[PDB]
Amino acid sequence: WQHGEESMAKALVACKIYRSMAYEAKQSDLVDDTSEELKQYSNDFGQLAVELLEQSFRQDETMAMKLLTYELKNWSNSTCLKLAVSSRLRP
Amino acid sequence: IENGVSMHKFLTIPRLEELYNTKQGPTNPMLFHLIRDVKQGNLPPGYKITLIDIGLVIEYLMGGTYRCTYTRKRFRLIYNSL
Amino acid sequence: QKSWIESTLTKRECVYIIPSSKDPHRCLPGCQICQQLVRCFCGRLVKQHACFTASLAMKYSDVKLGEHFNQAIEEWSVEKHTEQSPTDAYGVINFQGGSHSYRAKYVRLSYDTKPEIILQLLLKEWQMELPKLVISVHGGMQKFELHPRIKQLLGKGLIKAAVTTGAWILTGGVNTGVAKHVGDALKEHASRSSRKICTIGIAPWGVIENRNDLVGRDVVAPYQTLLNPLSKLNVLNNLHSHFILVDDGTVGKYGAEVRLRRELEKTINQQRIHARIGQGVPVVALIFEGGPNVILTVLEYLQESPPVPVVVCEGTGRAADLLAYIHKQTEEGGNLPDAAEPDIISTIKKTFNFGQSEAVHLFQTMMECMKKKELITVFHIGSEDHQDIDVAILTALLKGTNASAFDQLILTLAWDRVDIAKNHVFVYGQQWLVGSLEQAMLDALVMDRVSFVKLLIENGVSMHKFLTIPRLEELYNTKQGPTNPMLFHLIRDVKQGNLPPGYKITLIDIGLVIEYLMGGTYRCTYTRKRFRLIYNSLETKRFPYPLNELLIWACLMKRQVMARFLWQHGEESMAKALVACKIYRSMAYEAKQSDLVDDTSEELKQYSNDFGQLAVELLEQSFRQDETMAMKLLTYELKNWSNSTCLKLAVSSRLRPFVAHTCTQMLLSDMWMGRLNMRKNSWYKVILSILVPPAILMLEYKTKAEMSHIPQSQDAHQMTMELPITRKFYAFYHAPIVKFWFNTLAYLGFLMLYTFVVLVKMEQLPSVQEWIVIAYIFTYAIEKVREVFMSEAGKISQKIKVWFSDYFNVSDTIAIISFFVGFGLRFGAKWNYINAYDNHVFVAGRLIYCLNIIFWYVRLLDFLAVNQQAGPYVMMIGKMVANMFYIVVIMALVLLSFGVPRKAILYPHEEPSWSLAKDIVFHPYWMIFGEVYAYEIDVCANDSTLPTICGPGTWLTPFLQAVYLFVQYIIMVNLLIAFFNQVYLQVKAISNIVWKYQRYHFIMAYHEKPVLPPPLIILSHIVSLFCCVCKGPKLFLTEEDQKKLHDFEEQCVEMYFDEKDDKFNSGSEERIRVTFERVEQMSIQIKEVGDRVNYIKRSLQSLDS
Amino acid sequence: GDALKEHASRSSRKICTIGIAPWGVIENRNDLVGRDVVAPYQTLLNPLSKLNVLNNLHSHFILVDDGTVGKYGAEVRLRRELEKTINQQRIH
Ligand SMILES: CCCCCCCC/C=C/CCCCCCCC(=O)O[C@@H](COC(=O)CCCCCCCCCCCCCCC)COP(=O)([O-])OCC[N+](C)(C)C
Ligand SMILES: CCCCCCCC/C=C/CCCCCCCC(=O)O[C@@H](COC(=O)CCCCCCCCCCCCCCC)COP(=O)([O-])OCC[N+](C)(C)C
Ligand SMILES: CCCCCCCC/C=C/CCCCCCCC(=O)O[C@@H](COC(=O)CCCCCCCCCCCCCCC)COP(=O)([O-])OCC[N+](C)(C)C
Ligand SMILES: CCCCCCCC/C=C\CCCCCCCC(=O)O[C@@H](COC(=O)CCCCCCCCCCCCCCC)COP(=O)([O-])OCC[N+](C)(C)C
Ligand SMILES: CCCCCCCC/C=C\CCCCCCCC(=O)O[C@@H](COC(=O)CCCCCCCCCCCCCCC)COP(=O)([O-])OCC[N+](C)(C)C
Ligand SMILES: CCCCCCCC/C=C\CCCCCCCC(=O)O[C@@H](COC(=O)CCCCCCCCCCCCCCC)COP(=O)([O-])OCC[N+](C)(C)C
Ligand SMILES: CCCCCCCC/C=C\CCCCCCCC(=O)O[C@@H](COC(=O)CCCCCCCCCCCCCCC)COP(=O)([O-])OCC[N+](C)(C)C
Ligand SMILES: CCCCCCCC/C=C\CCCCCCCC(=O)O[C@@H](COC(=O)CCCCCCCCCCCCCCC)COP(=O)([O-])OCC[N+](C)(C)C
Ligand SMILES: CCCCCCCC/C=C\CCCCCCCC(=O)O[C@@H](COC(=O)CCCCCCCCCCCCCCC)COP(=O)([O-])OCC[N+](C)(C)C
Ligand SMILES: C[C@@H]1CC[C@@]2(OC1)O[C@H]1C[C@H]3[C@@H]4CC=C5C[C@@H](OCCC(CO)CO)CC[C@]5(C)[C@H]4CC[C@]3(C)[C@H]1[C@@H]2C
Ligand SMILES: C[C@@H]1CC[C@@]2(OC1)O[C@H]1C[C@H]3[C@@H]4CC=C5C[C@@H](OCCC(CO)CO)CC[C@]5(C)[C@H]4CC[C@]3(C)[C@H]1[C@@H]2C
Ligand SMILES: CC(C)CCC[C@@H](C)[C@H]1CC[C@H]2[C@@H]3CC=C4C[C@@H](O)CC[C@]4(C)[C@H]3CC[C@]12C
C-alpha cells in the first residue's frame, strides 16, 4: 500500500474487501473461520485513510474536499467517499 | 524493490495468475469458497484460477454495482488471446 | 504550447557527420564496417544520429564528400554544425527505491543558455524559492569512499547547514563522486522528514545512461534506477531533487557545465537576500576527495569575482585532505618549510601518478591557491574544530570579504542563526558604529526573529532611545514578514470603510482600532490631543514607556512569540497581560463576526487565554506575599492604559480565574461591607439596624487603616479624612450590604402588598395599598432608566444592548410596561355600579395585574442568586428551561399522536370548533402528570362516567392510551429528567466559579445605587438631579504608599519569573529524556575511551616488542 | 558578578553583593547624577570607556566621591573600615 499512488483509495477498498470477507465468514459459517482477524485488518486500513484525510485537510481544506469527490478510474469510476460509505467507515 | 526490481515490467498475466493460485505459503481457505459461489457453486476438481473469476469475486465483495477491470471487455479478450 | 521550457529554452542536435577514429578493419568489404563503427567528433554514429538531416548520410555516405580533405574534416564546432530545435525532455523522474519514490525533476539545455532564464526556470518555472545559501560542491568525480565517523559527522553538518539557511546544494548530479555521498547523507539523516534540503545536480545530457528514456514531453520519467555497472556513463543519484542537464550537443564529452554551473552561481550571488536585507546571496564552496582539477577550481574562487570562500574538509580523501597539509605546515602568508617542495612533490607522486615536473607545477599552483589563507577553511574534523562542517561553512562566509560586523550580523539574522551571531559577530573587541544595532533591530522585529531581538537587547540596545515615531510607524506598516490580514480590515471600519488605494498607516488610525478592540470608553494615548498634534508637527519622539507600545504591535499583528517575549520586559506586567487578553479576544470575535476571507480565530482565542493565565499567576504570587498589597494592585489607576484598572480590564475579557481568585473575593467582600466589620457583626444585626436605626450606633465600624486597600468614593474618602454620630449613619446607609437588605425588605413588603391587592377585591378607586404598589413600580422604573443612561459604555445603542442582555431586565421591562397597561385600564375605565366585573375594560386591567405579579415573584430568584448555596440552583433552572426545547417538541408530538385519534374515534359528529383544539391537548397533557382519567377510558363499561360517547371504535381508545402513557409517562418524562440530571451535574461542576465572577457586577451595582429604596428613591433622584443641573470608586494612595506599591509590584513581578524556570528545569519525564540525551555522550565516549583502550594495549606490548 | 548570573543565585534568593567604587571614574557618572531616579545606566560595553562599566549584577554601589576624578584608591581604607565596623557588631 505504501508504494504506488492512489493511497487513500486503496485503503478504503481494502477496508471494504476485508469487511465483506469478515461478514461472509460469519455468514458462510463453514469449516472457514478467522473473521475478527479480518475485522481488524479492515479497521487498520480504515484508520490509514482517515489519517491521510487529516493530513491532506490541514494543508488545504479546499483541495481535500476535491479529493473526496474525483472519479478514480482504476476503481470502477467510484469515489473515495462513496467507498468509505460502503464500509460504513464513520471516522 | 530497492535493488533493481521494478513491479512495472514484472507483473505479467501468467505470472500474477500464478501468484494467485498457489497453496505454497500462507494460504486462504476463504477465496476458494468465494470462487465457488461466483462459479455457480461448481468446481472442476482441478480448476486452475483465472484472473477473470477473481474479478467476479471483487464485484461480489465490493458490492453494489462495482465493475472490476478484470471482467471488462478488452481485458477479457486479450486474456484469452495471450 | 504553454511550455515555456519548449518555447524559450532549447536543445542541440548534431546536424553534420565527421568520422572519428575511422580505422577500417574486420569484414573485408569496406561499407559494412564503414557502417558498423564510424563515430563522429559529436560522439555518435552516423546511423545513431539520423536526425532528419543526418539520415541523408546513412543512405549515401557521411555528410560530406568522400576523402574530403583532412584539412577540412577536423572543423566541427557546435557553433558551426548544431541546430537548436526545442527540447524533448521536460518531464519528472520517479526514482524507485525504498518505501517512498524520491521524485525529482529535470530539463535539457545548452551550455550557453542565458544565466537569467536558467534562473527563470529554477524560481519561476520550478517554483523553487530563492535561497539564502548555496553549497557549491566540488569534490571527487569518481566513486570515492569514506569511513564511518566522517560519514556521519560531515553528513550532519553539511545537511544541517542547508536546513538552517534553506540552502541550495549544487553538485554534478552523478553518483560517481560527491553526488553519491551528498545524496546519501540526506537519505539516512531523514532530511526529508517534514522538510526539504533543496538539492540540484548540473550534469550533461549525453552521458546519463537511459537518457533516451527521459526523452519525451512532460511525463513521469521512468528512470529505472538500474545499478548495472556496465553503464559507466552514470546512474543519476536518486536523492537530488532537480537535474539540469546541459544538452551542449555532444555525447561522451565532458565539461559542458563547468562555466554554466558557475555562472548560475554567479547570478545566484547577484540577487537580494530578502529585501529588508540588502546583500547578495553568499556562496560557499566545498571540496571532497577530489582531483587535480578540483584543487584547480579553488584558484578559480580565491582570485575571482566577489571572493568565494572554500571549505576543504579534513580527512575525506586525496584533494580535500592534502589542501589541509599545505594549509597547516605553511604560514598565514603561505610560507613553506624550505624542504616542502623537496618532500611534498613525493606526496603528489605518492597520491597521484601526476608526475614530477607536473607535480612541481601542482604544488606551485596549489601555493598560488594558498597565497591567501584568510579565506579558506580547513574543517579539522579530527580534533573537532567547528564541531560540524556547518559552523565552519557559515563562519567562512562572515570572514574574508572585508565585511563589517553589521554586514556580518545582518546575514546571520537572515539565516535564523543566533548561535553564529552571539559566538562570532558578538565577539570580544568589536566596533558597532552608531545605529547598526538600531538598524538590525528594525530588521529583527519586522522579520519576527525574537532570538536576535533578545540578543540585541542584551548587547547594547535600549528600546528607550529606539522607538521613534517614523520608525514604529514603519514597523506597523510592513507586509515584510509575518503579516496580519485582520488589522487592514480593522483599519477599514474605523476609517469609514474607505481606503485610499495606497493608504500609509498612521499611529493615529491605530489608536481608533484599539479603542474599538478594548471597547467601552477606552482612550488610547495615540488619539489624545497632545500626541495628535506633535505627530503632525514632527528629540521628544522617544515614547516614555516603549515596551508598552510594542506589546500592542505584536498582538495586533498576531506575533505571539514576540508579544510574550516583550511582555517579560518593562513594567506593568499584570496590566499588559489583561489588555492583550482583551485585544486578542476581540479580534477572535471579529473574525467569527466579520466572517470574510480572514480566518484564524481559535488561534487568537488561545493567545488571549495564554496571557490571561499569566495575569492570574502573577496575582497568586503577589497575593502569597502580602494579601493587602495585592488588593491595592487590583485597584490603582494605571495612567498608561486610559486610567483604567487591572480588575476592570479582566472583567472586560470575562477572565474568570482572575475575578474568582481569592484576592478579588476578599476585596469584593470588603467593598460589600463598606465601613462595617461584619466578621464581628452579623447580617441579622444589619436587618435589625435598618428597622431600628439606633442600633446603627451600636455596630462595630472600621478605621482608615483597615479601609486603605478599598477603592472609595470622593466622599467616603473625604468624610473619613477630616468617629462622630453623623459619620456613623453615613457609613451604614452607604454600604452595599445595607442597600441590598434595604431594597430587599422593601421589595418583600412590595410583594406582600401587591399580593394583598390582587387577592382582595377592587373597588372603583385604588386603595392605599395599590397606590403604594404603583409608586414602587413607577420609581423602580425610573431607577432602571438611570442605570442604563448611567451605564459604563458610552454609545447609547450599546448601553442598551448590554442591559437587555440579562434575563431579569427583560422581564422587568415587560413587568413594568404590562403594569401600566393594566393601571390605564383599571383606572381609565367607566365604573358600572351594578357590578364591577361587567365592565370588560376594568376586568382586563385586573387580570393583567394578577399575571403581572408572576414577574415579581420570579425577580426574587435574582436576590437568591446572590447566595453561594442558592444561586447554583437558579442557574440550573434557566439552563433546564432554555435547552429542553427539542424533548418537549417530541412530547407535544406524542401528545397529538394520541389526542387526535382519541377525539376522532370518540367524537365523530363534530363540526369545526375551537373546542377541537382544546380537546386534543387537554386530557393528554394531564396524563403526563399521572392522571389517567380512570372512569373515562372504557366508555362502554358499566362504571363509565361517559356512557353516551359509546359507539363504534371506542374500544380502541384503551389500547391507544396504554401505548401513550408508556411512551409519555415512562419514556419521555424520564428522558427529560435524564437531561435535567446532566444539567445539574454540569452546573455544579462550574457553579462556584460563575457565582464568584457574578459577585463583581452585583457588588458594583450596589456601590452605585442610591441609599433610598424604590418608593423613597425619588428623593435621591431629585437631589441627585438638581445637583447636576445646578453644579466612581478610586483607590486613593498617598505618594508615600503609591511608591511602595510599585515596589511591591516589581518584587512580586520578579519573584514570579525566577520561579517558573526553576520548577520547569526539574520536571518529571523531562528529567528522564534529559537522561536519554545523556545516554549518547556516554555511549559515544565509552566508545571514545573504549576505542583507545585497544589503542593503549597494543602500545604496551609494542613498547615491549 | 558573572558567577551569580549563570548559577541562578537570584532564583527565589539573593546573594547580597556590594561594590565600593569611586565616583569620578565610572563612565556615565553624569547620567547617575540627579535626585532619586530610575538611574538609566546605559550598559554600553563601549571599550572606549576604560574608566569602567559598573558590573550589572552587583546589587549595591557605594561610590566614594572623595573629590577627585581619574584618581584611584579612595576606598582602600573606607572599604576596610566598613569591614572593620562589620566585624564589630553582634551576630544574632
Ligand atoms: C430603557 C428603559 C428600561 C426600563 C423600562 C421602563 C419603561 C416602562 C414603560 C412603560 C410604558 C407604559 C405604557 C402605558 C400605556 C397605557 C395604555 C393603555 O391601556 O391606556 C389606557 C388608558 O390610557 C390613558 O392615557 C389613561 C390612563 C392614565 C395614564 C396611565 C398610563 C401611563 C403611565 C406610564 C408610566 C410609565 C412608566 C415608566 C416611567 C419611567 C387606554 O384605555 P382606556 O382609556 O382605559 O380605555 C377607555 C375605554 N372606555 C372609555 C370604555 C372606558
Ligand atoms: C412552550 C410549551 C409548549 C408549546 C407552546 C404551545 C402550546 C400549544 C397550546 C395550545 C392551547 C390549546 C388551544 C386553546 C384554544 C381553544 C380553547 C377554546 O377556545 O375553547 C375551550 C376553552 O378553553 C379554555 O378555557 C382554555 C383551555 C386551554 C388548555 C391549555 C392547557 C392544556 C395543556 C396545553 C399545553 C400543551 C403543551 C405540550 C407540551 C408537552 C372550550 O371550547 P369553547 O368553544 O370555548 O367552548 C365553550 C363552551 N364551554 C364554556 C362549555 C366550554
Ligand atoms: C393478556 C390478557 C388477554 C388475553 C390474551 C388473548 C387475547 C384475548 C382477545 C381476544 C379477541 C377477542 C375479544 C373480542 C371479541 C368481541 C367481544 C367484545 O365485546 O368486544 C368489544 C370490543 O373489542 C372488540 O370489538 C375487539 C377487541 C380485540 C382486542 C384484542 C387484541 C389482541 C390482544 C392480544 C392477543 C393475544 C396474544 C398476543 C400477546 C403478545 C366490543 O365493544 P365494546 O368494547 O364492548 O364497546 C363498543 C360498543 N358496544 C358496547 C356497543 C359494543
Ligand atoms: C412601596 C413598598 C415598600 C415597602 C412597604 C411600605 C409600606 C409599609 C407600611 C404600611 C403598609 C400599609 C399601608 C397603609 C394601609 C392603610 C389602609 C387604608 O386603606 O386605610 C387605613 C389607614 O390608612 C392611613 O392611615 C393612610 C396612610 C397614608 C399613606 C402612608 C404611606 C407610608 C408608606 C410610604 C412608602 C415608604 C416606606 C418604606 C420605605 C422602604 C385604615 O385601614 P383599613 O382601610 O381598615 O385597612 C385596610 C384593609 N382594606 C383594604 C380591606 C380596607
Ligand atoms: C401581564 C402578563 C402578560 C404578558 C405575558 C408575557 C409572557 C412572558 C414572555 C416572555 C418571558 C419573559 C422574559 C423574556 C424571555 C427571556 C429572553 C432571553 O432569553 O434573554 C436572554 C437571551 O436572549 C436571547 O437569546 C434573545 C432571543 C430570545 C431567545 C428565544 C426565547 C425567548 C423568546 C420568547 C419565547 C416565549 C414567548 C414569549 C414572548 C412573546 C438574555 O439573558 P441572559 O442572562 O444573557 O441569558 C441568555 C443566554 N443564552 C443566550 C446563551 C441562552
Ligand atoms: C407594548 C404595548 C402593548 C399594549 C399597548 C396598549 C394597548 C391598548 C389596549 C386597549 C385599549 C382599548 C380601550 C377600549 C377600546 C374600546 C372597547 C371598550 O371600551 O370596551 C370593550 C373592551 O374590550 C377589550 O377587549 C378590552 C381589553 C383590551 C386589552 C387587551 C390586552 C392588551 C395588552 C396586552 C399586554 C401587553 C404587554 C406588553 C409588554 C411588553 C368591551 O368592554 P365594555 O365596553 O365593558 O363591554 C361592552 C359590551 N357589553 C354591553 C356586552 C358589556
Ligand atoms: C416575609 C418572608 C420573607 C422571608 C422569606 C423566608 C423564607 C426563607 C428565606 C430566605 C433565606 C435567605 C436569607 C438569609 C441569607 C443570609 C446569608 C446569605 O445568603 O447571604 C447572601 C446574601 O443574602 C441573600 O442572597 C439572601 C436573599 C434574600 C432575599 C430572599 C428572597 C427569597 C425568599 C422570599 C420568600 C419566598 C418563599 C416563600 C416563603 C414566604 C450572600 O451575600 P454576601 O454578601 O456573601 O453575604 C454576606 C457575606 N458572607 C456570606 C460572604 C459572609
Ligand atoms: C403561573 C405559572 C407558574 C409560574 C412558574 C414559575 C416561574 C418560572 C420559573 C423560572 C424562570 C426562569 C429562571 C431564570 C434563571 C436565570 C437564567 C439565566 O440567567 O439565563 C439562562 C437562560 O434563561 C432562560 O432560558 C429563561 C427561561 C425562559 C422563560 C421561562 C418560562 C417558564 C415556563 C416554561 C416551561 C413550560 C413548558 C410547558 C408548558 C405547557 C441561561 O441558560 P443557558 O443559555 O443554558 O446558560 C447560559 C448562562 N448565562 C446565565 C450566563 C447566560
Ligand atoms: C374478533 C377479534 C379477532 C382477534 C383479535 C386480533 C385481531 C385484531 C383485529 C381486529 C380486532 C377485532 C375487531 C372487531 C370489532 C368488533 C366490534 C365492532 O363491530 O365494533 C364496531 C365496528 O368496529 C370496526 O369496524 C373495527 C374495524 C377494524 C379497525 C382496524 C383495526 C386495526 C388493528 C391494527 C393491528 C395492530 C396491532 C398492534 C400492533 C403491535 C361496531 O360495533 P359496536 O362496537 O357495537 O359499535 C356500535 C354499533 N352500532 C353502530 C350498530 C350501534
Ligand atoms: C401586606 C400588608 C400587611 C399589613 C396590612 O396591609 C397589607 O394588612 C392589612 C389587613 C388589614 C385588616 C384586614 C381586616 C380587618 C378586619 C376588620 O374587622 C372585621 C370585623 C370584626 C368584627 O368584630 C371581626 O374580625 C377590621 C380591620 C382589619 C383588622 C384590617 C386592619 C388593617 C390591616 C391589618 C392591613 C395592614 C395595613
Ligand atoms: C403539524 C401540526 C399538526 C396538527 C396541528 O398543528 C400542526 O394542525 C393544526 C390545524 C388546526 C385546525 C385548523 C382549523 C380549524 C378550524 C377551526 O374552526 C373555526 C371555529 C368556529 C367555531 O364554531 C368558527 O365559528 C377550529 C379549529 C381547527 C379545527 C384547528 C384545530 C387545531 C389544528 C388541528 C392544529 C394542530 C395542533
Ligand atoms: C395565551 C394567553 C392568552 C393565556 C395565558 C398564557 C400563559 C401561558 C402566560 C400568562 C402569564 C405568563 C407568565 C408571566 C410571567 C412569567 C415570568 C417570566 O420570568 C417567565 C415566564 C412567566 C412564568 C410567564 C409564563 C407564561 C404565562 C403563564
DSSP letter string, C108-130? EE-TT--HHHHHIIIIIIT-PPP
- What are the Cα distances from residue C957, in Å, to C236, C267, C960, C961? 88, 95, 5, 6
Residue C385 CB contacts under 8 Å (≥ 6 apart), including other chains: C379, C392
Residue C1069 CB contacts under 8 Å (≥ 6 apart), including other chains: none
H or E segment to which residue C1061 belongs: helix C1039-1066
Cell, residue C598: 480572514
Please state whether at least 3 CB pairs lie below 8 Å between chains B and C: yes
Nearest CA to ligand 7 atom 36: C860
Identify the residue whose cell numbers are 477473470: B52
Alpha carbons within 13 A on the beta-carbon side of C918: 4
The count of other CB atoms within 10 Å of the CB of residue C368 is 14
3-state helix, strand, coil in chain C (%, to 5): 55, 5, 40
C180 vs C335: CA distance, rounded Å: 36
Chain C positions in Cβ-Cβ contact with residue B4 (cut-off 8 Å): 225-228
Q: List subunits contacting chain D, requiring 3 or more Cβ pairs under 8 Å.
A: C
* Neighbour-count burial of C305, counting CB atoms closer than 10 A to its CB (0-12 exposed, 13-18 middle, 19+ buried): exposed
Identify the residue whose cell numbers are 556496465: C230
Q: Please count the residues of chain B.
A: 82
Report the SS3 class of residue D39. Answer: coil
The count of other CB atoms within 10 Å of the CB of residue B74 is 8
Which long-range contacts does A58-65 make (Cβ < 8 Å, 24+ apart)?
none
| Closest by Cβ to A20, choosing from B7, B33, B61 | B61
H or E segment to which residue C134 belongs: strand C134-137
Cell, residue C1066: 526539574
CA C648 to chain centre: 27
Q: How far is C623 from chain D (nearest CA, A)?
A: 16
* Neighbour-count burial of C775, counting CB atoms closer than 10 A to its CB (0-12 exposed, 13-18 middle, 19+ buried): middle
Cell, residue A43: 479497521
Beta bridge partners of C280: C272
Residue C124 CB contacts under 8 Å (≥ 6 apart), including other chains: C4
Closest to C811 in 3D by CA, of C854, C752, C866: C854
Give C931's DSSP letter.
-
D57 vs D6: CA distance, rounded Å: 11
Alpha carbons within 13 A on the beta-carbon side of C371: 9
The count of other CB atoms within 10 Å of the CB of residue C610 is 16
D27 vs D47: CA distance, rounded Å: 11
Chain C positions in Cβ-Cβ contact with residue A3 (cut-off 8 Å): 99
C614 vs C1060: CA distance, rounded Å: 11
H or E segment to which residue C187 belongs: helix C178-189
Q: How far is C989 from chain D (nearest CA, A)?
A: 35
Residue C774 CB contacts under 8 Å (≥ 6 apart), including other chains: C766, C819, C823
Angle, helices C807-827 vs C768-789, to 10°: value is 140
**Residue C135, amino acid:** I
Closest ligand by atom to C863 CA: 7
* Neighbour-count burial of C597, counting CB atoms closer than 10 A to its CB (0-12 exposed, 13-18 middle, 19+ buried): exposed
Q: How far is B20 from chain C (nearest CA, A)?
A: 24
| Closest by Cβ to D44, choosing from C429, C460, C1062 | C460
- What are the Cα distances from residue C959, in Å, to C931, C963, C964? 16, 6, 9
| C449 CA → ligand 8 middle, Å | 52
H or E segment to which residue B76 belongs: helix B73-81
Cell, residue C299: 584558484
Angle, helices C973-1008 vs C736-759, to 10°: value is 120
- Measured from the Cα of C752, ligand 10's closest atom is 1
Protein residues whose CB sits closer than 6 Å to any atom of ligand 2: C 888, 891-892, 895, 913-915, 917-918, 921-922, 925
C218 vs C409: CA distance, rounded Å: 44
- What are the Cα distances from residue C557, in Å, to C322, C445, C477, C550, C792? 54, 12, 10, 11, 29
**Is-contact C246 C257, C-beta < 8 A?**
yes
Given CB atoms, is B19 within the 8 Å cutoff of chain C?
no
Q: How far is B82 from chain A (nearest CA, A)?
A: 22
Enumerate the H helices of D29-89 as residue ranges: 29-32, 78-84
Verify whether the Cβ–Cβ distance C97 to B2 is below 8 Å.
yes
Residue C476 CB contacts under 8 Å (≥ 6 apart), including other chains: C505, C507, C510, C553
Verify whether the Cβ–Cβ distance B63 to A16 is below 8 Å.
yes
Alpha carbons within 13 A on the beta-carbon side of C164: 19
| C995 CA → ligand 5 middle, Å | 22
Tell me whether strands C92-93 and C220-221 are parallel, antiparallel or unpaired: parallel
Interface of C with A in 62-101 (CB under 8 A): 99-100
Given CB atoms, is A3 within the 8 Å cutoff of chain B?
yes
C811 touches ligand 12 (CB under 6 Å)? yes
CA C1063 to chain centre: 26
Please state whether at least 3 CB pairs lie below 8 Å between chains D and A: no
Cell, residue C430: 568589536
**Is-contact C201 C236, C-beta < 8 A?**
yes
Verify whether the Cβ–Cβ distance D45 to C459 is below 8 Å.
yes
H or E segment to which residue C20 belongs: strand C19-20
**Is-contact C776 C748, C-beta < 8 A?**
no
Dihedral angle, C-alpha C149, C152, C154, C157, nearest 10 °: -140
- Measured from the Cα of C821, ligand 6's closest atom is 6
**Is-contact C680 C700, C-beta < 8 A?**
yes
Chain A positions in Cβ-Cβ contact with residue C100 (cut-off 8 Å): 2
DSSP string, C844-902: HHHHHHHHHHHHHHHTHHHHHTTSTTTHHHHHHHHHHHHH-HHHHHHHHHHHHHHHHHH
Identify the residue whose cell numbers are 436587618: C687
Experimental technique, in short, is cryo-EM
C479 vs C692: CA distance, rounded Å: 71
| Closest by Cβ to B2, choosing from C98, C222, C228 | C98
C799 vs C787: CA distance, rounded Å: 9
Residue C950 CB contacts under 8 Å (≥ 6 apart), including other chains: C939, C940, C944
C688 touches ligand 6 (CB under 6 Å)? no
Q: How far is C239 from chain B (nearest CA, A)?
A: 13
Q: Please count the residues of chain D.
A: 92
**Planar angle of CA C355, C359, C360, nearest 5 degrees:** 130
Residue to substitute in C898, C916, C919 for testing ligand 11 pocket (most ligand atoms within 8 angstroms of CB): C916
C977 vs C990: CA distance, rounded Å: 20
Closest to C1065 in 3D by CA, of C1077, C1056, C1078, C1074: C1074
- What are the Cα distances from residue C225, in Å, to C182, C462, C659? 17, 59, 68
Please state whether at least 3 CB pairs lie below 8 Å between chains C and D: yes
- Phi, psi (5° rounding) for residue D19? -120, 110
Identify the residue whose cell numbers are 495628535: C532
**Is-contact C1010 C1024, C-beta < 8 A?**
yes
C129 vs C5: CA distance, rounded Å: 18
C732 vs C686: CA distance, rounded Å: 9
C200 Rama class: left (phi>0) / alpha (psi -120 to 50) / beta:
beta
Enumerate the H helices of chain D as residue ranges: 2-7, 29-32, 78-84
C1013 vs C1016: CA distance, rounded Å: 6
Give C112's DSSP letter.
T
Distance in angstroms between the alpha carbons of the first and the last residue of chain D: 28
Residue D79 CB contacts under 8 Å (≥ 6 apart), including other chains: D20
Resolution, rounded to a tenth of an Å?
Answer: 2.5
Residue B57 CB contacts under 8 Å (≥ 6 apart), including other chains: B31, B34, B35, B38
Minimal-distance CA residue of chain C relative to A2: C99
**Is-contact C330 C340, C-beta < 8 A?**
yes
3-state helix, strand, coil in chain B (%, to 5): 45, 0, 55
The count of other CB atoms within 10 Å of the CB of residue A52 is 17
Cell, residue A77: 469510476
C1053 vs C1059: CA distance, rounded Å: 11
Cell, residue C424: 562570532
Give A2's DSSP letter.
-
- Phi, psi (5° rounding) for residue C607? -65, -35
Cell, residue C829: 375605565
- What are the Cα distances from residue D67, in Å, to C1043, D35, D36, D74? 33, 19, 21, 9
CA C931 to chain centre: 60
- Phi, psi (5° rounding) for residue D18? -135, 140
Residue C822 CB contacts under 8 Å (≥ 6 apart), including other chains: C844, C845, C846, C848, C849, C852
Cell, residue A28: 458462510
C871 vs C988: CA distance, rounded Å: 10
| C844 CA → ligand 6 middle, Å | 7
**Is-contact C199 C185, C-beta < 8 A?**
no
C753 vs C759: CA distance, rounded Å: 10
Residue to substitute in C955, C957, C966 for testing ligand 9 pocket (most ligand atoms within 8 angstroms of CB): C955
C797 vs C789: CA distance, rounded Å: 10
- What are the Cα distances from residue B7, in Å, to B16, C101, C595? 11, 13, 50
Given CB atoms, is B41 within the 8 Å cutoff of chain A?
no
